[PDB]
Design an enzyme around this catalytic site. Structure first.
Site, PDB file in Angstrom:
ATOM      1  CG  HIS A   1      -1.615  -1.305   1.414  1.00 16.39           C
ATOM      2  ND1 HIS A   1      -2.517  -1.788   0.489  1.00 16.39           N
ATOM      3  CD2 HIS A   1      -1.532  -2.215   2.409  1.00 16.39           C
ATOM      4  CE1 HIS A   1      -3.002  -2.941   0.934  1.00 16.39           C
ATOM      5  NE2 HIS A   1      -2.412  -3.217   2.123  1.00 16.39           N
TER       6      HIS A   1
ATOM      7  CB  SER B   1      -0.104  -0.060  -4.276  1.00 13.55           C
ATOM      8  OG  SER B   1      -0.976  -0.199  -3.164  1.00 13.55           O
TER       9      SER B   1
ATOM     10  CB  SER C   1      -4.266   0.501  -0.544  1.00 15.55           C
ATOM     11  OG  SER C   1      -3.207   0.064  -1.378  1.00 15.55           O
TER      12      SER C   1
ATOM     13  CG  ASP D   1       0.560  -6.083   2.649  1.00 16.67           C
ATOM     14  OD1 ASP D   1      -0.291  -7.012   2.693  1.00 16.67           O
ATOM     15  OD2 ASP D   1       0.492  -5.049   3.325  1.00 16.67           O
TER      16      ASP D   1
ATOM     17  CD  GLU E   1       3.096  -5.148   7.043  1.00 13.83           C
ATOM     18  OE1 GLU E   1       4.339  -5.259   7.013  1.00 13.83           O
ATOM     19  OE2 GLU E   1       2.467  -4.356   7.818  1.00 13.83           O
TER      20      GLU E   1
ATOM     21  CG  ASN F   1       0.533 -11.236  10.357  1.00 17.10           C
ATOM     22  OD1 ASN F   1      -0.101 -10.208  10.110  1.00 17.10           O
ATOM     23  ND2 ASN F   1      -0.011 -12.262  10.968  1.00 17.10           N
TER      24      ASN F   1
ATOM     25  CE  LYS G   1       1.208  -6.717  10.070  1.00 16.42           C
ATOM     26  NZ  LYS G   1      -0.073  -7.314   9.586  1.00 16.42           N
TER      27      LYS G   1
ATOM     28  CG  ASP H   1      -0.973  -3.919  11.120  1.00 14.93           C
ATOM     29  OD1 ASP H   1      -2.103  -4.329  10.817  1.00 14.93           O
ATOM     30  OD2 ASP H   1      -0.048  -3.537  10.299  1.00 14.93           O
ATOM     31  CG  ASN H   2      -2.738  -8.353  11.884  1.00 15.60           C
ATOM     32  OD1 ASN H   2      -1.771  -7.586  11.739  1.00 15.60           O
ATOM     33  ND2 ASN H   2      -2.791  -9.542  11.313  1.00 15.60           N
TER      34      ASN H   2
ATOM     35  CB  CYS I   1      -9.117  -3.668  12.019  1.00 16.60           C
ATOM     36  SG  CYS I   1      -8.143  -4.375  10.672  1.00 16.60           S
TER      37      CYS I   1
ATOM     38  CG  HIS J   1      -8.059 -12.525   1.360  1.00 17.04           C
ATOM     39  ND1 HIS J   1      -9.367 -12.793   1.737  1.00 17.04           N
ATOM     40  CD2 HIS J   1      -7.684 -13.507   0.468  1.00 17.04           C
ATOM     41  CE1 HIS J   1      -9.779 -13.903   1.084  1.00 17.04           C
ATOM     42  NE2 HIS J   1      -8.760 -14.362   0.326  1.00 17.04           N
TER      43      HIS J   1
ATOM     44  CG  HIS K   1      -3.857  -0.358  10.284  1.00 13.47           C
ATOM     45  ND1 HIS K   1      -5.191  -0.515  10.003  1.00 13.47           N
ATOM     46  CD2 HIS K   1      -3.350  -1.606  10.415  1.00 13.47           C
ATOM     47  CE1 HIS K   1      -5.471  -1.801   9.967  1.00 13.47           C
ATOM     48  NE2 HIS K   1      -4.355  -2.488  10.188  1.00 13.47           N
TER      49      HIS K   1
ATOM     50  CB  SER L   1       3.420  -3.143  10.903  1.00 14.85           C
ATOM     51  OG  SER L   1       2.252  -3.246  11.680  1.00 14.85           O
TER      52      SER L   1
ATOM     53  CD  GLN M   1       7.843  -5.880   6.211  1.00 15.88           C
ATOM     54  OE1 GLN M   1       8.954  -6.278   5.902  1.00 15.88           O
ATOM     55  NE2 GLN M   1       6.736  -6.458   5.756  1.00 15.88           N
TER      56      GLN M   1
HETATM   57  N1  LIG Z   1      -7.256  -4.568   6.151  1.00 13.55           N
HETATM   58  C1  LIG Z   1      -6.142  -4.487   6.880  1.00 13.55           C
HETATM   59  O1  LIG Z   1      -5.553  -3.429   7.115  1.00 13.55           O
HETATM   60  C2  LIG Z   1      -5.630  -5.762   7.472  1.00 13.55           C
HETATM   61  C3  LIG Z   1      -4.828  -5.845   8.625  1.00 13.55           C
HETATM   62  C4  LIG Z   1      -4.169  -7.054   8.905  1.00 13.55           C
HETATM   63  C5  LIG Z   1      -4.583  -8.218   8.255  1.00 13.55           C
HETATM   64  N2  LIG Z   1      -5.500  -8.158   7.218  1.00 13.55           N
HETATM   65  C6  LIG Z   1      -6.035  -9.370   6.542  1.00 13.55           C
HETATM   66  O2  LIG Z   1      -7.209  -9.769   7.228  1.00 13.55           O
HETATM   67  C7  LIG Z   1      -7.388 -11.189   7.115  1.00 13.55           C
HETATM   68  C8  LIG Z   1      -7.512 -11.771   8.499  1.00 13.55           C
HETATM   69  O3  LIG Z   1      -6.294 -11.512   9.213  1.00 13.55           O
HETATM   70  P1  LIG Z   1      -6.194 -12.044  10.729  1.00 13.55           P
HETATM   71  O4  LIG Z   1      -4.857 -11.625  11.214  1.00 13.55           O
HETATM   72  O5  LIG Z   1      -7.425 -11.624  11.477  1.00 13.55           O
HETATM   73  O6  LIG Z   1      -6.263 -13.644  10.560  1.00 13.55           O
HETATM   74  P2  LIG Z   1      -6.766 -14.735  11.634  1.00 13.55           P
HETATM   75  O7  LIG Z   1      -6.488 -16.137  11.216  1.00 13.55           O
HETATM   76  O8  LIG Z   1      -6.252 -14.231  12.949  1.00 13.55           O
HETATM   77  O9  LIG Z   1      -8.362 -14.496  11.612  1.00 13.55           O
HETATM   78  C9  LIG Z   1      -9.233 -14.945  10.586  1.00 13.55           C
HETATM   79  C10 LIG Z   1     -10.386 -15.639  11.245  1.00 13.55           C
HETATM   80  O10 LIG Z   1     -11.378 -15.971  10.242  1.00 13.55           O
HETATM   81  C11 LIG Z   1     -12.050 -17.090  10.703  1.00 13.55           C
HETATM   82  N3  LIG Z   1     -12.815 -17.646   9.610  1.00 13.55           N
HETATM   83  C12 LIG Z   1     -12.329 -18.336   8.527  1.00 13.55           C
HETATM   84  N4  LIG Z   1     -13.266 -18.769   7.726  1.00 13.55           N
HETATM   85  C13 LIG Z   1     -14.443 -18.306   8.282  1.00 13.55           C
HETATM   86  C14 LIG Z   1     -15.790 -18.425   7.894  1.00 13.55           C
HETATM   87  N5  LIG Z   1     -16.193 -19.091   6.815  1.00 13.55           N
HETATM   88  N6  LIG Z   1     -16.727 -17.869   8.703  1.00 13.55           N
HETATM   89  C15 LIG Z   1     -16.317 -17.227   9.806  1.00 13.55           C
HETATM   90  N7  LIG Z   1     -15.081 -17.035  10.257  1.00 13.55           N
HETATM   91  C16 LIG Z   1     -14.178 -17.615   9.454  1.00 13.55           C
HETATM   92  C17 LIG Z   1     -10.964 -17.991  11.278  1.00 13.55           C
HETATM   93  O11 LIG Z   1     -11.471 -18.947  12.198  1.00 13.55           O
HETATM   94  C18 LIG Z   1     -10.049 -16.960  11.955  1.00 13.55           C
HETATM   95  O12 LIG Z   1     -10.294 -16.875  13.362  1.00 13.55           O
HETATM   96  C19 LIG Z   1      -6.198 -11.679   6.270  1.00 13.55           C
HETATM   97  O13 LIG Z   1      -6.600 -11.734   4.904  1.00 13.55           O
HETATM   98  C20 LIG Z   1      -5.146 -10.599   6.570  1.00 13.55           C
HETATM   99  O14 LIG Z   1      -4.083 -10.552   5.629  1.00 13.55           O
HETATM  100  C21 LIG Z   1      -5.992  -6.931   6.822  1.00 13.55           C
END
Ligand SMILES: NC(=O)c1ccc[n+]([C@@H]2O[C@H](COP(=O)([O-])OP(=O)(O)OC[C@H]3O[C@@H](n4cnc5c(N)ncnc54)[C@H](O)[C@@H]3O)[C@@H](O)[C@H]2O)c1
Ligand SMILES: NC(=O)c1ccc[n+]([C@@H]2O[C@H](COP(=O)([O-])OP(=O)(O)OC[C@H]3O[C@@H](n4cnc5c(N)ncnc54)[C@H](O)[C@@H]3O)[C@@H](O)[C@H]2O)c1
Ligand SMILES: NC(=O)c1ccc[n+]([C@@H]2O[C@H](COP(=O)([O-])OP(=O)(O)OC[C@H]3O[C@@H](n4cnc5c(N)ncnc54)[C@H](O)[C@@H]3O)[C@@H](O)[C@H]2O)c1
Ligand SMILES: NC(=O)c1ccc[n+]([C@@H]2O[C@H](COP(=O)([O-])OP(=O)(O)OC[C@H]3O[C@@H](n4cnc5c(N)ncnc54)[C@H](O)[C@@H]3O)[C@@H](O)[C@H]2O)c1
Ligand SMILES: Nc1ncnc2c1ncn2[C@@H]1O[C@H](CO)[C@@H](O)[C@H]1O
Lengths: 461, 461, 465, 461
Positions: B53, B76, B81, B131, B156, B181, B186, B190-191, B195, B315, B374, B382, B386
């Protein structure tokens, strides 16, 4: 003619039974294990020394172990944690229990000894269930012959696990253990959410103080510190957090707490000059959550705001320097497990003195000392783990292995994730929660089985 | 005469620089690494392909890598983003960047190719910062010869790490990686907290809808789901949580959320009859957080309340079945990254139709698509990770090792806890937090060094 | 005891007095507005000659109120306004100080009425009472209906609670109110302190003491979203309950929505036609906890109780026991006492129950005020506001001497009034200082700019806060 | 040939219409009034001078007044509050509107003058809708002849009502007014919950700063201060509250805020010595909520932590001493409505200077200046009250009454509680809320009608 027990008052038994029957309805994972395993009797032949808070919740655990075929001999791991009606109900069911609320230290040790000995000789024990490691330590120091025949220890709490890991490191641990604490359905359930429920509960029962708009200092931000911080903040306290772990401190900041040290620049040189007197002069409530020693020390106690409440929800009585307070200051009992500590001197006190602190449970676990500790629905998770850990170690039969095979199994381990997940599912159903089932394509997409486990062992939740 | 870039509008550079100078003051861990390593130039000779991003925060990361001696070529990892003022400021500093907000899929691929190729030939790249794994996959499928000279990948995000671990399992990963990650500074910064900050931010910018008193369904309760659920609940939304993981579900219940499935009894048999139409008929906002495919499927979209908002913070764009919506329903652009999806059919729509959904960022990362993702102070953690990961892998020089030595170092690793703790401490100081130092006796009592690490690698925080 | 041969009281256990005194000495340190009034007015003795019939929960907090009135020169005779609200150590400490008190936890209805009568009568004849302090209007009603002659000598009533104020206003409308009253409830330092924040503190407290149930992640229905409903809803939501709110007042419902609650009715489309068919059985089948907060009748009715989820907790934090249809449960269902103020209500029938029956509800405090019945009600620092207002109201009406006015002058003074905003502000300032709060002083320019005095009042009487 | 308007860009009209069509779906009380009163045309012959923020939400208000038969001429009551797409959509509908985002003070006055005059002469105005009293004051000072023919003023906001009450007290108010502000569905909806939604929104759009774990000072704890405090606390800010009103201060304490003064012992001497430098040195964010003058004064601004954010959500820009900052300090524009104020001096600044404050919207309403103000579903209540107030005063026809009858009706009044309740019911139904109906017995028991009103006029909610 059952007499193999010592409790405050056996006539409380009917009351205790009424409370057990309600608690069972709050503990679906535990009651599920009863229904699942009752037929199979997987603890038939198990003889369990148990040392854990003789509460109603512990009562449901005891009767689950017994329903699965175990015999037990039980004591409390804390002098103030027993619910006398729970102890009475267990004694009246013909189960040996040695526990009452308000034991002396001598009585506490006598109670553990009464579990270990039956009719003046070592009981034919083959399993240990412990909370904090006191029974574990007595067996290693005083009864090594008994450990020869013991298949394992299932240890409830962070402090007990630390003591097991020290023994493992030093080559002094004699039997394998399951670390029950580090199940997610224990550590991130009981340690955190249990304290969220029970800390404000105990402070209300002990003091009835308004918490909203008043200043708290929580020492620690581990699982117990996180839950403790939320217990107070959700009531509207202004909570500051102390930590030695910068990662835990980072979490406190992100969770919306100010992170402070009792000591200038965080340096505890043991002098009064090191105390941030301005910070401690503003604190209405200090809570210790660390598992560590002297984290609320003499100089902090001297600097605390007049009429501040002091309490400990982590381990033993030495998180707060109560020894300093016994030596130097006059204790006025308000009511059981509540003392005004008069900072005017040791000998007398003026009934109207304004310069006092309020100490809860004499610096012992405040949630169990001044209230009833964690609620049934939370302890359900911890205690489902205990039962599964007892089954695992009993069925492995360590004591009957050859020396070479013992060497390979002598470890401190957690339950596998699949069991942690199954306990979680029973807990979720108790909330009326509905867990989604993965489709085959979705299970393939994220690389898991439809039945789990859903996370790698590295996952932190 | 610098022309080795493509951005929306180079004249935004001055604005981008003003925002970089502010963001630096919010990122003490990153600016600490600049001050610490600038003299020693640990990335001198590093040639980094970066795909993440192109935000102001990514700008501070890029300029830290460059300040430590790296050359970079940047794109990116998402079509929506980029902050065009950030891309302009980086191009204006003479750094090759190929990024704008609102790329097509073709332009997205072209931008990654422009980092890989310099003057129509493979760049002499020796490091990858990724990422989500798209650049990693393109290098492995299309430019395997380039990976011969690459010392490592620093990845990432959860989804990218999953893709790396698949490659490692299948023996197709050609260079070692650091899983950035799973640093605590991180994943559980971050995660989750990222959010928490950025989801309600993006929903407000995109829709300006009141969230208080309205009904949300958050699919997933991982780190992103946890933070997303808090983002909405703290605004007064009534949040329901869906999960496949019973442990995560247990955490949702304890955190005060109702856990529900879109499907009756949680069973998605693929039929409309399986959809809980009564539940979906009440939902005003659905947020996908899973990293999984089709967790907001066509039957769910059909059953959703009229004028519900739909968005994805996980994702890709495949968490929501956007393909089904493009095939079947008419899209009306409200403004960029906001579409009304008319469920009345594909051909036309009535401007006054009441039967539509609002889709944010065409089902792509909503926090970065509809807001700025974020905040700096969170991305600081994060991006400090890196930089430390880039230093570690570059200094290890995998590509220059003999075959025998490579075999042993071809792995996906996390940073040591000690570095995670050092990043955390810099973050805490940026809040004005003061970490307490253990006494020798206290450090001995809990079995840690006064310097840390303070927890075993098993600790979940 | 204190006074030689003192027997003019009835409490559970006089040996609790020393314990009660220890708790009074702590509570004083939590009640700076009340203790400020003591220090301010002690010398002046503004209640010298005041003879106060008091009827309010005989708690530690009420003890500090009583001893404030006595310190300012009053004599009192005291009873509780609730059968379960007395703290027996508080009652004992007050009796041991030589103050007539007739109160214990767990009174029967007969004992309750006898206790009020023992305040009214001294040595078998009406006491020479000249002031009334009441909470809920029972003593007020008994004086009007049974002892009208006593009201000839009474200068005023100071009434604590919403329900009592309603009853006073009905009496005023009907021309049956015989002495002027101060509505203490509608001080902001009462209504928007005690009624709301008191319940926020004390509702989850009482549910924990009574049941030890986990609240987090469970389903509550709070009936009402007035001051008590607002505080009650927060008490549960802050613990992580999923709280739904019922209201008849659309403005209070709007506040519930904005505060992040789903607003629901026990009845389909909110219409209670009295039929079972009107009950939303699906909604009530999901509820773990119902809390009534209304001051109204049968807001948790028989059909709702029939439809409730098995093992739901039922309780009332509104002033009387008819918010829940407990009469229906006494008539139809078997009551099993778990422990004091906690009953399992077995919906399997009236005559006997299976100890292991799964089809029961848990009723707290037999449908009476749950915060006081199962815990200790509001904390000292909150009751400080309410009770500082009570003392100010007692001083005001006693000094006005209504009973000594000519008939023509009485006609003009026969009213139900609130305290002036300036006194409400002065109570608030003492409360703020007890938190270590620092109130800013307006500059003359700023005071002129917004049109107030530097000393206040800072808001017009229309202001809602 | 419609030319009787001035907006930034008429080509934004289609976009504004798209947003109006969505906003209508968020505003059921307003849309209900359209459906209810359409046929009856109760504002036929009404000619309304409107001066209120030319937002999308204001657009729905305007088109409701027009749908009920009114003609209007419209301006904004703030130089930064207009949404240019809303202004364009209203102009394109043939409604006279003089409003754009980023007016000068001269342009602001010219816009109000263009509503008052049509073709260089006083418009045949007979109704006034005002927000803050600027139009009301211009009519009283400059156009008293026009007030002879005006039936009433409906005034939106606390500050405007104060100005009306001063006029009534001084005998200078010429036409009756409705205080729309003190409807519960206005004051305890808009002023509180609106700011809860829109303050953190504006701070995120303006700065993208993480708020969690940072220190805020909110000056004031009225309706706006309450909502502002919650806006920040729900994000995890550590919020301190200042007040002059001890009752509002008491509420802040009970709501879990520390109550502090910028001045030692709360006494503002006018001297630097009076400033609590230690307190202001820790503050990351100051928000003014008072409707008062100089509550964030020059000495406070001098003492503030470097890089603190300063903003005002009270109705005018004199809450903060912006005049002192214009006189003494150099302003660097970051982007529109965001300035760095360099405390190093007036004439020039170092681009990399660390000693600056960030001022949002040049000290004007931050929610409308840096974001879009309150969300539709909140403004629905305020604007439903406006429409009912316009109907009430228009139907009363004050301007056509004899002098003796006018004398009796010349007042500042609120709408009847019954109408407040009717607005509330429509708002509740938009959440899917279900209000219970009293039984006849229940209504008699609490002494109200089954259809209300449910509370006495003294009730504070
Ligand atoms: N948008 C952002 O800024 C940002 C930040 C960090 C991560 N992400 C992305 O967000 C996603 C999740 O990251 P995370 O760290 O929370 O992963 P994680 O594994 O900690 O959490 C994902 C959760 O989804 C659940 N899940 C899977 N399939 C499901 C379904 N069918 N119904 C309900 N729940 C279901 C899993 O049980 C798990 O607990 C990834 O794609 C990651 O790369 C985005
Ligand atoms: N009362 C209960 O019901 C209950 C529940 C579970 C655990 N416990 C006990 O609580 C204690 C903590 O358990 P946990 O699971 O939270 O452990 P933990 O390791 O998760 O957390 C303890 C924290 O204390 C911090 N700490 C240590 N020394 C400190 C100091 N001097 N100043 C500040 N912070 C310091 C550590 O950095 C760590 O984060 C243990 O004694 C455990 O057995 C009690
Ligand atoms: N337990 C305590 O410590 C405590 C505290 C103060 C007051 N009270 C009592 O609490 C009760 C409520 O007091 P309050 O100050 O909140 O009064 P209030 O008038 O502010 O609120 C009562 C609410 O109940 C609502 N209501 C009435 N009938 C209803 C019905 N059938 N369904 C749903 N909602 C309905 C009303 O619309 C109103 O908003 C009174 O009896 C009062 O005396 C008790
Ligand atoms: N931005 C918006 O969208 C929005 C919304 C509604 C109202 N407003 C405006 O916000 C302002 C406040 O409105 P309100 O309804 O909250 O008024 P209010 O009277 O309810 O609250 C203002 C508060 O400021 C306090 N105050 C006064 N001087 C002070 C000082 N020097 N220090 C500290 N506190 C002080 C007062 O005691 C009072 O409680 C007005 O100008 C109003 O018109 C703006
Ligand atoms: N109600 C309770 N009954 C039994 N054990 C409890 C209870 N509450 C907390 N504990 C346990 O106390 C331990 C600390 O000694 C914690 O690990 C927790 O598991």
């Amino acid at each position: 003619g059952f007499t193999d027990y010592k409790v405050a008052d056996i006539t409380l038994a009917a009351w205790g039974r009424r409370e057990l029957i309600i608690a069972e309805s709050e503990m679906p994972a535990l009651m599920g294990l009863r229904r699942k395993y009752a037929g199979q009797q997987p603890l038939k032949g198990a003889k369990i020394l148990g040392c854990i808070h003789m509460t109603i919740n512990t009562g449901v655990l005891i009767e689950t172990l017994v329903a699965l075929g175990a015999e037990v001999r039980w004591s409390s791991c804390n002098i103030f944690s027993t619910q006398d009606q729970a102890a009475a109900a267990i004694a009246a069911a013909g189960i040996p229990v040695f526990a009452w609320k308000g034991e002396t230290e001598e009585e506490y040790e006598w109670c553990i000894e009464q579990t270990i000995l039956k009719d003046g000789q070592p009981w034919d024990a083959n399993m240990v269930l412990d909370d904090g490691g006191d029974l574990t330590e007595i067996l290693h120091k005083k009864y090594p012959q008994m450990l020869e025949r013991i298949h394992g220890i299932t240890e409830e709490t962070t402090t007990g696990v630390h003591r097991l890991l020290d023994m493992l490191k030093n080559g002094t641990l004699k039997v394998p253990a399951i670390n029950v604490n580090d199940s997610v359905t224990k550590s991130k359930n009981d340690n955190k959410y249990g304290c969220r429920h029970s800390l404000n509960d105990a402070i209300k029962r002990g003091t009835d103080h308004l918490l909203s708009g008043k200043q708290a200092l929580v020492i620690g931000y581990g699982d117990v510190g996180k839950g403790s911080s939320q217990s107070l903040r959700q009531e509207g306290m202004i909570v500051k957090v102390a930590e030695v772990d910068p990662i835990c401190a980072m979490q406190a900041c992100m969770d919306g707490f100010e992170v402070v040290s009792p000591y200038k620049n965080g340096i505890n040189d043991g002098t009064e000059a090191s105390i941030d007197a301005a910070l401690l002069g503003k604190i209405d409530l200090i809570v210790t959550t660390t598992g560590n020693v002297n984290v609320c020390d003499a100089n902090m106690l001297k600097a605390l705001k007049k009429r501040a409440v002091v309490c400990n929800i982590g381990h033993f009585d030495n998180e707060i320097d109560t020894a300093f307070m016994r030596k130097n200051w006059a204790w006025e009992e308000v009511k059981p497990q509540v003392h005004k500590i008069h900072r005017t001197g040791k000998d007398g006190f003026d009934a109207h003195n304004d310069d006092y602190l309020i100490l809860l449970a004499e610096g012992r676990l405040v949630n169990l000392g001044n209230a009833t500790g964690h609620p049934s629905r939370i302890m359900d998770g911890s205690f489902a783990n205990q039962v599964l850990a007892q089954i695992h170690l009993f069925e492995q039969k360590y004591a009957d292995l050859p020396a070479a095979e013992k060497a390979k199994r002598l470890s401190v381990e957690v339950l596998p994730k699949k069991l942690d997940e199954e306990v979680a599912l029973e807990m979720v159903k108790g909330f009326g929660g509905v867990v989604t089932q993965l489709t085959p394509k979705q299970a393939e997409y994220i690389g898991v089985s439809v039945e789990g486990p859903f996370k790698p062992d590295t996952y932190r939740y």
